[PDB]
Write a protein that binds this ligand. Sequence first.
Ligand SMILES: CC(=O)Nc1ccccc1C(=O)NN
Ligand SMILES: CC(=O)Nc1ccccc1C(=O)NN
Ligand SMILES: [Zn+2]
Ligand SMILES: [Zn+2]
Ligand SMILES: [Zn+2]
Ligand SMILES: [Zn+2]
Lengths: 360, 360
Amino acid sequence: MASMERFLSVYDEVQAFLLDQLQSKYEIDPNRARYLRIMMDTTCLGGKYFRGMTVVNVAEGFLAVTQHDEATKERILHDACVGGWMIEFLQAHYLVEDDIMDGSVMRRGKPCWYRFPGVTTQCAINDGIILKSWTQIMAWHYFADRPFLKDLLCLFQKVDYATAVGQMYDVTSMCDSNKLDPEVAQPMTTDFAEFTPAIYKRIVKYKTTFYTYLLPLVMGLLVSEAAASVEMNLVERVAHLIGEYFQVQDDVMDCFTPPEQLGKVGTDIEDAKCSWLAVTFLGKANAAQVAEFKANYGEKDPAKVAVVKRLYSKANLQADFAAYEAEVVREVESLIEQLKVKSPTFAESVAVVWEKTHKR
Amino acid sequence: MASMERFLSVYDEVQAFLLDQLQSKYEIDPNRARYLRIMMDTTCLGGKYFRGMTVVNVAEGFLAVTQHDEATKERILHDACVGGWMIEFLQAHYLVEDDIMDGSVMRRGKPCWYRFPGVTTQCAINDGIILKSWTQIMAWHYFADRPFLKDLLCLFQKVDYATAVGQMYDVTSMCDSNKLDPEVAQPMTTDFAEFTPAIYKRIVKYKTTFYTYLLPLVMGLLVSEAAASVEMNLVERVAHLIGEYFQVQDDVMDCFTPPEQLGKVGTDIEDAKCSWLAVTFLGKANAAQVAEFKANYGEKDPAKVAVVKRLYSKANLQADFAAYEAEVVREVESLIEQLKVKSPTFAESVAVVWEKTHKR
Ligand SMILES: CC(=O)Nc1ccccc1C(=O)NN
Ligand SMILES: CC(=O)Nc1ccccc1C(=O)NN
Ligand SMILES: [Zn+2]
Ligand SMILES: [Zn+2]
Ligand SMILES: [Zn+2]
Ligand SMILES: [Zn+2]
């Protein structure tokens, strides 16, 4: 069986399980099941499945070097697929809620879920809640007797919580820290003093890297009973590194990738986000460039947004991006080597994860 | 130590733990810790703690009839307090998200969290996410080596998921089921055919009873290692019963309790909710009363809202409420008796829970 065919098959299995359970146990009616089925499909399907398929790829790597009965290979692959779907549904939860929080319009060339006419914000907030709740149902059902259940649920919780804290760091990145106050409406920074590489790194570490890279790699190790083939501090190090690079690419595309190709209209400039471009720009700008940036950033006026894109465009940020890229290539290749001391297999999966990231 | 003093003390402990953890492990800064501290206080504190204190009361009941070392009594009481706070934070999550979903204004005489000037919807959605995430952190930290950890986390998940499904039943209660469709903007019912006692019961079972009554009673049993002193089917039966009664009281107050005493302006009529009053009214109305209700319900116009309150007011719904009340008294007293076959203690705690409900 090709990996993706298996993974998609398991989607249909898990869907059927969750919807059947809602009928036998939760008194649901056919029509509300249908709404939830459509919600699931709409929010979970249509991506590349990178996160979920990484769990499967990591487990296939170990299968090739470990002795097992055929039924045990099938159980491991089925558990890798379940776990990969947990991650995909977790991502779905955050995309639905983020889209609502950020007033987003489109995602992937289609309207955000909350914007569907028969959804609305009132239902979509709860739909997003349900998406994450289904991750737990999956785990307690498919993994009920498994040795790794405890470790997987603990890992998933820590990853979820890091991700929520990263959303907080992200949405507050354009405020001055010393002015955060629930009682007082929050003004945009005027000094941009908190637009630094270290602050940027913290936002991205927490908002994306844990769920996108750490969790799929560690989940693959757990369903394989292979956590002893790695040094976990190295797996954390390489996940945070590759994950940062991924987000830098995403920041640059928000600004410069045509909307029809990006799948949405990028608004990081108007939203005053602490993006890689803003930080890198401030890190090399002269005084008049910093002042022009300040007069124009975080405004909806398209003329000001164009002034920002022009400043970025003339500041030779491609050079800074290639220098960054070169350094990440260098460091990820060193970590991959440190990962061979214990597992060629796992180091190769990390290599594949890097290749898929680097060359998109 | 009085129970409430202990419970409040443990709040301060748990708060300190979560905020310290955010500093040592999650790279938080003092200012964002302070925002989260204020958020926690604002959303978790200020109620009666009924839910959390039930866990403590149930565990105190068992302590009085079970032999233990004093350190073991202290550990049980501390675990009951932690678990009670998990429930209180879970309720906080749902109140924050519900308030956003329903466009609520006030809760308990203060603005809803999302309406604070330095919060907004963008941050409050995520704050609510964090509230529930903190329930998990509590459990994995305080209960890490406890025998009941697995059973508690499984119970809490099922309760959370039931509650989300109940929010779905609630927010869609005024739509015709056969017209639910994410693609099509949802019209209000015109026939009210789905405003039935059985449909009402399903909404309330799921939206309130599991977290308000089932979970505190079962959590008390689990931290006490006492689940064998009960027949779980009876504990489910009595929790769903008392919980329904609680929600009927809440529905009647939304309509008839003065705003300054209710702590908010009740809008169930304007929101077209499937309330006890609407259902009970339709269950006795003549044809002209049903038609007047239909012409007036689910509208913001205060004159129409007054027409609805007038219809309810002339339909002798107090009689139906006393008849309901009498039947619930009767049935809960029968269940309490069935609960003595195994535990006087637990049956008394259920009695107290009922007294606190019935006489508010
Ligand atoms: C078209 C494109 O992909 N990028 C740019 C265009 C204009 C200015 C800067 C960049 C850039 O990448 N900066 N790092
Ligand atoms: C003042 C009050 O608490 N209740 C009513 C007032 C007017 C009409 C009906 C009721 C009622 O309770 N119905 N069950
Ligand atoms: Zn966002
Ligand atoms: Zn982006
Ligand atoms: Zn609501
Ligand atoms: Zn109410």
